[PDB]
């Protein structure tokens, strides 16, 4: 019998993993501070990696990759993409971005050098700003940095994707969430199911102070949007409907137009940081579930916007995905008495 | 280094004689005090329990005490009786009548100075005396009353040495007189104040072990003392045998006792033997020794939590297997080990096994379920004391009901202290 | 990556390799502390012995 | 030439010292009676091995070494063992009763009683020195003597030799071989009192040595002897620049200068490779590149931690055997490309390297095999502070209930020394964190 410990009660995915583990009858849960665990579903902040792996007679395994924050917080990820040769500043799937610190290293003096060449060349010059609520999409810089300095934390501002792919009927934006599980061996597994978090308001390319047809957050759509759920239940179109739409309207497959680029981008990013975070020869082992967020443009080209390191699922898919985490992340290390993941290797 | 051993009373002396027999065998010493064993390990630390005398003789560093000569004479005529130095026999004539007050206050005071004279002689012939172990019963008269009187005297003359006791707890299933709760309670009050470490040897437990599992239909004191001499040899092996852990009484006190009052230990032994052929496997040994059915103190360990555990393995076996098995118990039952004392279970191995065993395991647990024992005594105390029953035997010797009330309170406080950490 | 201060001899050599530039109390107080703890100890012993006298 | 005096305190220090001086003697060709034929300068000299051995008129080479323990059973084994003739009796100092796993007993109650004797005997060593440069002090964190007596002796050495360097080799506690439940307390106490009296300290985590001995030596349940012979190897690797011809780490001061920029953070991480069983029938010999790469596997560190999630402040490579610089810089280049090695702002990204062409001497009959080349990397990474975290957390669990505090107080220590020590360590932990993240 294996023992685990839960340190993030506010995690939907792992609350369901805890329930599934007990159900086997081969996993008992201990108190959050008992160090004689096999498995830690750690806290999201200041997880005590240094205390893992020092219990004799216990193989110990944790649901985060120490160092994975470098991919999963926005300025960190920009820094990683620019400075890492494997991705390079010539990266063709990540938008132009820059790291700006408030008034109170910084890149706004390098920003302006590109922004003014965008305004002179008479190119679309919309730029978005955000850090890791408080979003500004603007057409001229003096709105952007002015807003950044009213807040007090590091910000990234990046080339807004002016020509996105719009779903018809409705002429609306969306983002694609892929769920990726990296196990203790560093197998990269992409879950067969993704989701399209859409917008319920036709895309208004006029004034960029309305965030209802430009930002695709499940929260800002239930409350402040007109017809939340008119086209799909909860603003969420899954992969079958979207493949079917791609075939009918655009004469292609989701696999061919989009997925191939996504599988490339995932594998890029993870293989890039693998030597810094891998636990292959460590005294404790790591797996981690990641949420890659993608935006497709009107030319069927995929772009990576955020990597989230503590992601929630879609109520329909919690069961299958959390059962998969158990199968390939947890039972692989602690075995009990047709896979839903695509393995990414090349 | 040196240990000075005291046995007091009928019960004290009987289990002490058996102890000296057993370890005198284990160290190759015969009833005449001449060494006749083969190996080396038998003599490396022989001086912890024995003095060397003329002609390469070994004399146990032991003082025999009683208020009546019956049991002392029995020991002299007993198997190893002539191994002790006769001057170390200190006895009265009048007896103590199962009366704590007589042993502590009237009859025993008359005899206590000469006992301390012999103690003094034994200690000044020590190179570095570590402390004393006293064997006695808590329900009798001499053992409980005069032994606890001895103990506090000893504490006064040697306040920087360790006081350790094997204390046999009275039980109605094995009972001589009705006043045994009284005596017990008055003793426990003493012990919680003047011992560093006390092995609670419950006669209830010993009876149940002889009955339910050894299948002995009518257990005698002998059947009980065989378990006792087994357990004593176990819990002192790391004292008298050279090991990697090179242990003494003060280290055991330091590491087993988080708080000074909670020094009452639950001992256990495996395999449980009667006075066999199948070798025990290390996993067997390891989960018999943790079994409630192997503990000499009658308490359910699952009814509280372990503060500390020491576990000794005797015999030739796989250190690796013992390590693994000990860890499986802790990791599979970590509910019952307090988390605020990290790595509270320590293990020792001694190559030499006891007589008649390929491999054995001995258990020393400091658990809050020991409270059950004291609660038992306290209930038995109160049922009489709420009617002042049998008190006259005590007030006849000069005692006051007040002293009883104070002993009772202190033991109740002791139980509460254990309950405080059972929920921490 | 440049190799500097190479010093070498019949038992071995040593050198440096750069890959990138840069981006108490007195004897008095001690014996006072030791004797302070001796005093607390002697006081706890006196406390004990007086109690044992009672 | 400047001499070094080794002081071994407690069981752990004394048995490790036994190990190291056995190794030392094999290495300099010093026989068990103290005779070194290659030494033509009879009765004296200012040779490099003389920093650790003094010479008698009779050609006997005698360790500049004191062994001190509060009970006699371990040093008695020195007095009757193979190398009894090596040591002059008044260098072996024993008491009568140990400190019973209690820092307060060793620092206060018993230490006071035996500190002035020890200091006198060390002075008799120092008085045989033309230009003493300082001390190498070996001791456990866990034991009563090892923690308590050591920090008292460190304080007093800072007084009686205030311009001399003091280096520690300290055994950090691990449960697979630990002898006491109160070892986190002693570890925090002795670290807080010693911190300002120690210029550089090499921590060795028993958990690490144990695992190294299980994985690489196929020893199923390692003994102190196993552990010590491997630790002596590492210690010999560290001190060889003091006992041999060379230009790197020639004096104790050079260890501070090369490994310890901030004075408080004076805990280098030792990593050693290769460690190869003697019972390996078919072993093939690892390249310079292979062993310099193993220097960055956490399974080869003296302390299990992850330098990838820290920063370096210093790095030194000590090779022994068939090694030339160019193979060194080859392996460095490729490793820099394939590994996470981040230095702090204000530090050069670089390696101070030392080579000594004689391969590691191994104890005949031991568990370790000769290899043609070996290396020890001393790196001042902030990741070693992980260890302090583990320790402090254990400390905290116990002290929250004042469990076992009573034993210390009863020796004359004040409860406030507990918080004070813990209080400093939380300082230390923060220094590491700000220097490193
Ligand atoms: N590596 C190694 N560790 C040892 C050795 N001996 C003891 N230890 C460790 O040291 C710690 C115990 O400290 P000791 O040095 O034995 O204690 P002491 O210094 O003798 O102090 P007291 O015996 O309490 O008076 C534990 O963590 C042991 O595992 C040894 O020979 N080698
Ligand atoms: N285990 C054990 N208990 C005993 C023995 N003899 C007496 N007792 C118990 O001790 C108590 C009687 O005290 P006793 O030792 O005879 O009186 P004392 O001589 O004045 O100490 C009762 O609880 C008895 O069951 C014995 O040999 N073995
Ligand atoms: C729980 O922590 C500890 C408990 C006890 C101890 N020591 C000092 C011991 N002493 C003696 Cl005499 N016998 C022992 C027998 C054992 F099986 C284990 C330890 C023993 C050390 C640490
Ligand atoms: Ca010479
Ligand atoms: Cl000086
Ligand atoms: Mg009787
Ligand atoms: Mg010792």
Q: What is the CATH number of the domain that holds D275?
A: 3.30.1330.20
**CA A180 to centroid of chain Cα atoms:** 9
Task: Assign residue A65 a region (left: φ > 0; alpha: ψ between -120 and 50; beta: otherwise).
Answer: beta
The H or E element containing residue A319 is helix A318-325
Instruction: Say yes or no: B110 and B80 in one domain.
Output: yes
* Spatial CA neighbour of C19 closest among D148, A294, D343, A16: D343
Total structural domains within chain A: 2
CA atoms of A36 and B207, how far apart (whole Å): 37
Q: Are D124 and D88 in contact (CB under 8 A)?
A: no
* Spatial CA neighbour of D142 closest among D93, D167, D177: D177
Considering only CB atoms, which residues of chain C are within 8 Å of chain B?
45, 48-49, 52
Examine residue D92 and state whether it is found in any structural domain, yes or no.
Answer: yes
Residue ending a domain, among D259, D294, D320, is D259
CB pairs under 8 A between A and D: 37
Q: Are D109 and D412 in contact (CB under 8 A)?
A: yes
Q: Are B390 and B384 in contact (CB under 8 A)?
A: yes
Q: Are D366 and C21 in contact (CB under 8 A)?
A: no
CA atoms of A24 and A336, how far apart (whole Å): 8
Instruction: Say yes or no: D217 and D326 in one domain.
Output: no
Burial class (CB in 10 A: 0-12, 13-18, 19+), A142: exposed
Domain span at residue B153 reads 2-265
Each as own residue / partner, the long-range contacts of residues B405-408 (CB below 8 Å, 24 or more positions apart, any chain) are B406/B189, B407/B185, B407/B186, B407/B188, B407/B189, B408/B185, B408/B378, B408/B381, B408/B382
Inter-chain touch C49–B152, beta carbons under 8 Å: no
3-state secondary structure of A126: coil
Examine residue D419 and state whether it is found in any structural domain, yes or no.
Answer: no
3-state secondary structure of B167: strand
The H or E element containing residue D167 is strand D165-172
3-state secondary structure of A255: helix
Q: If you measure from the C-alpha of residue D143 to the centroid of ligand 1, how many angstroms do you get, rounded to a whole number?
A: 5
Using a CB-CB distance cutoff of 8 angstroms, which residues of chain D are in contact with residue A276? 308, 340
Q: Are C4 and C18 in contact (CB under 8 A)?
A: yes
Q: If you measure from the C-alpha of residue B367 to the centroid of ligand 3, how many angstroms do you get, rounded to a whole number?
A: 15
Instruction: Say yes or no: D179 and D304 in one domain.
Output: no
CA atoms of D213 and D205, how far apart (whole Å): 13
CA closest to D143 among chain B residues: B251
Q: In this structure, what CATH number is given to the domain that contains residue B157?
A: 3.40.50.1440
CA atoms of A254 and A191, how far apart (whole Å): 15
Total structural domains within chain D: 2
Examine residue D85 and state whether it is found in any structural domain, yes or no.
Answer: yes
Instruction: Say yes or no: B215 and B328 in one domain.
Output: no
Instruction: Say yes or no: A180 and A325 in one domain.
Output: yes
CA atoms of B409 and D295, how far apart (whole Å): 64
Q: Are D197 and D153 in contact (CB under 8 A)?
A: no
Side-chain half-sphere exposure of C20, counting CA atoms within 13 A: 12
Inter-chain touch B346–D96, beta carbons under 8 Å: no
3-state secondary structure of D168: strand
Interior CA angle at B195 toward B75 and B43, to 5°?
Answer: 55
Q: ω into residue B35 within 30 of 0, thus cis? A: no
CA atoms of B219 and B3, how far apart (whole Å): 32
Examine residue A261 and state whether it is found in any structural domain, yes or no.
Answer: yes
Instruction: Say yes or no: D141 and D87 in one domain.
Output: yes
Residue ending a domain, among B370, B394, B411, is B370
Instruction: Say yes or no: D379 and D325 in one domain.
Output: yes
Instruction: Say yes or no: B97 and B126 in one domain.
Output: yes
Q: Are B312 and B350 in contact (CB under 8 A)?
A: yes
CA closest to A55 among chain D residues: D175
CA closest to B342 among chain A residues: A35
Residue ending a domain, among A62, A85, A107, is A62
Instruction: Say yes or no: D180 and D286 in one domain.
Output: no
Binding-site residues of D for GTP: 10-12, 15, 71, 99, 140, 143-146, 179, 183, 206, 224, 228, 252
Side-chain half-sphere exposure of A205, counting CA atoms within 13 A: 12
Strand-by-strand arrangement of the A39-41 sheet: A27-29, A2-6, A39-41, A61-62, A285-286
The residue whose CB lies within 8 Å of the most ligand 2 atoms, and thus the one to mutate among B6, B7, B8, B10, is: B10
Instruction: Say yes or no: D176 and D311 in one domain.
Output: no
Domain span at residue A30 reads 2-62
Examine residue A295 and state whether it is found in any structural domain, yes or no.
Answer: yes
* Spatial CA neighbour of B154 closest among C52, D407, C54, C47: C52
3-state secondary structure of A259: helix
CA atoms of A108 and A115, how far apart (whole Å): 10
Which chains have 3 or more CB–CB distances shorter than 8 Å to chain C?
A: B, D
Strand C12-20 with C2-9, pairing? antiparallel
Whether A34 contacts chain B with CB within 8 A: yes
The experimental technique used to determine this model is X-ray
Total structural domains within chain B: 3
Neighbours of B398 (CB within 10 A): 10
User: How many angstroms is the resolution?
Assistant: 3.4
Instruction: Say yes or no: D44 and D76 in one domain.
Output: yes
Instruction: Produce one character per residue of D152-162: b if its CB has 16 or more CB atoms within 10 Å, e if not.
Output: bbbbbbbbebe
Which chains have 3 or more CB–CB distances shorter than 8 Å to chain B?
A: A, C, D
* Spatial CA neighbour of D375 closest among D361, D360, D396, D395: D360
Domain span at residue D354 reads 269-386
Q: Are D314 and D260 in contact (CB under 8 A)?
A: yes
Beta strand segments in B351-396, E: 359-367
Residue to test with chain D: of A49, A76, A272, A283, most D Cβ within 10 A: A283
Instruction: Say yes or no: A322 and A208 in one domain.
Output: yes
CA atoms of D69 and D77, how far apart (whole Å): 12
């Amino acid at each position: 019998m294996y023992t685990f410990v839960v340190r993030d009660e506010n995690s939907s995915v792992y609350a369901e993993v805890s329930r599934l583990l007990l159900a086997t009858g081969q996993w008992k849960r201990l108190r959050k501070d008992n160090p004689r665990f096999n498995l830690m579903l750690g806290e999201r902040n200041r997880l005590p990696f240094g205390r893992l792996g020092h219990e004799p007679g216990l193989v110990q395994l944790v649901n985060y990759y120490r160092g994975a924050d470098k991919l999963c917080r926005k300025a960190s990820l920009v820094k990683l993409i620019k400075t890492s040769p494997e991705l390079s500043e010539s990266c063709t799937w990540f938008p132009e971005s820059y790291v700006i610190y408030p008034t109170n290293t910084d890149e706004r003096e390098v920003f302006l050098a590109a922004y003014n060449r965008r305004r002179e060349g008479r190119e679309g010059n919309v730029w978005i700003a955000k850090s890791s609520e408080g979003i500004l999409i603007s057409s001229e810089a003096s709105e952007l940095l002015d807003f950044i300095d009213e807040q007090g934390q590091v910000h990234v501002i990046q080339k807004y994707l002016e020509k996105p792919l719009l779903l018809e009927p409705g002429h609306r934006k969306f983002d694609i969430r892929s769920w990726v599980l990296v196990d203790h061996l560093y197998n990269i597994y992409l879950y067969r199911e993704g989701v399209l978090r859409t917008s319920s308001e036709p895309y208004n390319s006029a004034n960029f102070q309305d965030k209802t047809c430009h930002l695709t957050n499940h929260c800002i759509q239930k409350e402040y949007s007109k017809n939340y759920g008119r086209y799909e239940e909860g603003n969420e179109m899954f992969f079958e409907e979207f493949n079917q739409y791609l075939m009918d309207a655009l004469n292609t497959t989701l696999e061919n137009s989009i997925l191939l680029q996504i599988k490339h981008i995932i594998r890029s990013c993870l293989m890039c940081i693998e030597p810094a975070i891998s636990t292959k020869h460590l005294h404790y082992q790591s797996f981690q579930l990641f949420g890659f967020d993608f935006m497709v443009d009107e030319e069927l080209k995929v772009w990576l916007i955020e990597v989230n390191g503590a992601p929630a699922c879609a109520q329909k898919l919690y069961a299958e995905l959390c059962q998969g985490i158990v199968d390939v992340a947890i039972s692989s290390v602690f075995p009990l008495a047709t896979s839903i993941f695509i393995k990414l290797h090349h | 280094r040196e240990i000075v051993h005291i046995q007091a009373g009928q019960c004290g002396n009987q289990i002490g004689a058996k102890f000296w027999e057993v370890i005198s065998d284990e160290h190759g010493i015969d009833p005449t005090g001449s060494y006749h064993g083969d190996s080396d390990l038998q003599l490396e630390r022989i001086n912890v329990y024995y003095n060397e005398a003329t002609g390469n003789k070994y004399v146990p560093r032991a003082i025999l005490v009683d208020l009546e000569p019956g049991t002392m004479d029995s020991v002299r005529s007993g198997p190893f009786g002539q191994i002790f130095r006769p001057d170390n026999f200190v006895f009265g004539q009048s007896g103590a009548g199962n009366n704590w007050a007589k042993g502590h206050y009237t009859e025993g005071a008359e005899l206590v100075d000469s006992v301390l004279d012999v103690v003094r002689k034994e200690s000044e012939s020590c190179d570095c005396l570590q402390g004393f172990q006293l064997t006695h019963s808590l329900g009798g008269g001499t053992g409980s009353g005069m032994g606890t009187l001895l103990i506090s005297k000893i504490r006064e003359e040697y306040p920087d040495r360790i006081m350790n006791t094997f204390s046999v707890m009275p039980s109605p299933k094995v009972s001589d007189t009705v006043v045994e709760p009284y005596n017990a309670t008055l003793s426990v009050h003493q012990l919680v104040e003047n011992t560093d470490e006390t092995y609670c040897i419950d006669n209830e437990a010993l009876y149940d072990i002889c009955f339910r599992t050894l299948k002995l239909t009518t257990p005698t004191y002998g059947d009980l003392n065989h378990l006792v001499s087994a357990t004593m040899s176990g819990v002192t092996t790391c004292l008298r045998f050279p090991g990697q852990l090179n242990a003494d009484l003060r280290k055991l006190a330091v590491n087993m006792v988080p708080f000074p009052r909670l020094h009452f230990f639950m001992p256990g032994f495996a395999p449980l033997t009667s006075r066999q052929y199948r070798a025990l496997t290390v996993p067997e040994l390891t989960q018999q020794m943790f079994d409630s059915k192997n503990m000499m103190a009658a308490c359910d360990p699952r009814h509280g939590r372990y503060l500390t555990v020491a576990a000794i393995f005797r015999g030739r076996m796989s250190m690796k297997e013992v390590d693994e098995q000990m860890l499986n118990v802790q990791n599979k039952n970590s509910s019952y080990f307090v988390e605020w004392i990290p790595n509270n279970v320590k293990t020792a191995v001694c190559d030499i096994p006891p007589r008649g065993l390929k491999m054995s395991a001995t258990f020393i647990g400091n658990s809050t379920a020991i409270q059950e024992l004291f609660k038992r005594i306290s209930e038995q105390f109160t049922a009489m004391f709420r009617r002042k029953a049998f008190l006259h035997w005590y007030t006849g010797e000069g005692m006051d009901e007040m002293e009883f009330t104070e002993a009772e309170s202190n033991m109740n406080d002791l139980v509460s202290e254990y309950q405080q950490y059972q929920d921490a | 990556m440049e190799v500097i201060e190479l010093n070498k001899c019949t038992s071995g050599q040593s050198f440096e390799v750069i890959l990138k530039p840069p981006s108490d109390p007195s004897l008095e107080e001690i014996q006072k502390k030791l004797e302070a703890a001796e005093e607390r100890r002697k006081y706890q012993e006196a406390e004990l012995l007086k109690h044992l006298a009672e | 030439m400047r001499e070094c005096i080794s002081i071994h305190v407690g069981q752990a220090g004394v048995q490790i010292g036994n190990a190291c001086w056995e190794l030392y003697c094999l290495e300099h060709g010093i026989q068990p009676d103290g005779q070194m034929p290659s030494d033509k300068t009879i009765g004296g000299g200012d040779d490099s091995f003389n920093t650790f051995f003094s010479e008698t008129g009779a050609g006997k080479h005698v360790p500049r070494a004191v062994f001190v323990d509060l009970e006699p059973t371990v040093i008695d084994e020195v007095r009757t063992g193979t190398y009894r003739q090596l040591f002059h009796p008044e260098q072996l100092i024993t008491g009568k009763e140990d400190a019973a796993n209690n820092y307060a007993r060793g620092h206060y109650t018993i230490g006071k009683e035996i500190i002035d004797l020890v200091l006198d005997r060390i002075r008799k060593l120092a008085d045989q020195c033309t230009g003493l440069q300082g001390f190498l002090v070996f001791h456990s964190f866990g034991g009563g003597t090892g923690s308590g007596f050591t920090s008292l002796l460190m304080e007093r050495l800072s007084v009686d030799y205030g311009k001399k360097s003091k280096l520690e080799f300290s055994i950090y506690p691990a449960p697979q071989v630990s002898t006491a439940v109160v070892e986190p307390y002693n570890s925090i106490l002795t670290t807080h009192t010693t911190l300002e009296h120690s210029d550089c300290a090499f921590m060795v985590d028993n958990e690490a040595i144990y695992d190294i001995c299980r994985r690489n030596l196929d020893i199923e349940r390692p003994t102190y002897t196993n552990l010590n012979r491997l630790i002596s190897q590492i210690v010999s690797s560290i001190t060889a620049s003091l006992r041999f011809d060379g230009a790197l780490n020639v004096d104790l001061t050079e260890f501070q200068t090369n490994l310890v920029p901030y004075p408080r953070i004076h805990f280098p991480l030792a990593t050693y490779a290769p460690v190869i069983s003697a019972e390996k029938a078919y072993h093939e010999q690892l390249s310079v590149a292979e062993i310099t790469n193993a220097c960055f596997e956490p399974a080869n560190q003296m302390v299990k931690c992850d330098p990838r999630h820290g920063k370096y402040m210093a790095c030194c490579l000590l090779y022994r055997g068939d090694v030339v610089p160019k193979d060194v810089n080859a392996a460095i280049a490729t490793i820099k490309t394939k590994r996470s090695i981040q230095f702090v702002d204000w530090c050069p990204t670089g390696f101070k390297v030392g080579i000594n062409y004689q391969p590691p001497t191994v104890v005949p009959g031991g568990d370790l095999a000769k290899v043609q080349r070996a290396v020890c990397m001393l790196s001042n990474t902030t990741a070693i502070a992980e260890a302090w975290a583990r320790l402090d957390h254990k400390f905290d669990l116990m002290y929250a209930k004042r469990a076992f505090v009573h034993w210390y107080v009863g020796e004359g220590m004040e409860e406030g020394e507990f918080s004070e020590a813990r209080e400093d360590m939380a300082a230390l932990e923060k220094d590491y964190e700000e220097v490193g993240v």
